Copies of this chain bind each other. A is one copy, B any other.
Amino acid sequence: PPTLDSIITEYLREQHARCKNPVATCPPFSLFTPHQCPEPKQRR
């Protein structure tokens, strides 16, 4: 049976698939903020 340790596990992962160039070892999350993986921002 599912719990909140499976729903909130899967709630972020489909939110993670809108990351342009996503990550693998992600930082800790924040449910009250949107999630966006670090985009390529060139300065050099």
Contacts and interface: CB of A to CB of B under 8 A. Distances in A.
A5 interface: no
The quantity of this chain's copies bound in the complex is 2
Interface in A1-41: 1-2, 7-8, 10-11, 14, 31-32
Contacts of A8: 7
Interface residues of A, number: 9
A31 B11 contact: no
Given A7-B7, A7-B8, A8-B7, A2 B14 contact: no
Contacts of A31: 2, 7
Contacts of A14: 14
Given A7-B11, A14-B14, 8 more contacts: A1-B32, A2-B31, A2-B32, A7-B7, A7-B8, A7-B31, A10-B11, A11-B11
